[PDB]
Design a binder for this molecule. Structure first.
Ligand SMILES: CC(C)CN(C[C@@H](O)[C@H](Cc1ccccc1)NC(=O)O[C@H]1CO[C@H]2OCC[C@H]21)S(=O)(=O)c1ccc(N)cc1
Ligand SMILES: [Cl-]
Lengths: 99, 99
């Protein structure tokens, strides 16, 4: 779809078989999801944002559906203020910014 | 223009008579600019993201040119690690996310 920006660009995702709400976030390099149980191996990592750094679990090669579009890639799981879909997955679904 | 998301969606902006590079950020409600000495009145604000909150100065009705497109609106200034063009100004330049 074409998504205008008067409202937050919130979509439904499916991850680990579970539906969640997430924000399409062109300012995020990486995808960061709130704490949840997720099948797969993970590695400890840190990620920084506007306010500093947090600890996350890095899950590689996770299947995620984003507004009906399939991606398979890295998801960081940790205490984020919001579920954010970053460029690592937005590129997989063919998203571009246009003006 | 169309901006793909393989790389950070950085554009040149003009604000307070200075040129800067900034992210076109669909995940940001508001525009946040790295510390700079803007004239005029402001109001304190706190904004939160990954890692917690930062203190910023909220300036209203600030003129800002974004990739050659004029805009005017609220700009938050403070110790952000990135210049962030948020939805309050993305809408003014007619930006959409498309997939
Ligand atoms: C977390 C979002 C809901 C909100 N953020 C916008 C977001 O696009 C930031 C924007 C951003 C960009 C660079 C540095 C800090 C913040 N990106 C971000 O945190 O991405 C993280 C995940 O991937 C990594 O790549 C960038 C940092 C990491 S935010 O910068 O915290 C922010 C929060 C509150 C307001 N009012 C305005 C902006
Ligand atoms: Cl505004």
């Amino acid at each position: 779809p074409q998504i205008t920006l008067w409202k937050r660009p919130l979509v439904t995702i499916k991850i680990g078989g579970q539906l969640k709400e997430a924000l399409l976030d062109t300012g995020a390099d990486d995808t960061v999801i709130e704490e949840m149980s997720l099948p797969g191996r993970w590695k400890p990592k840190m990620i920084g944002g506007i306010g500093g750094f947090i600890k996350v679990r890095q899950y590689d090669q996770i299947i995620i559906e984003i507004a009906g579009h399939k991606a398979i890639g890295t998801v960081l799981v940790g205490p984020t203020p919001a579920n954010i879909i970053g460029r690592n997955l937005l590129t997989q679904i063919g998203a571009t910014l246009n003006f």
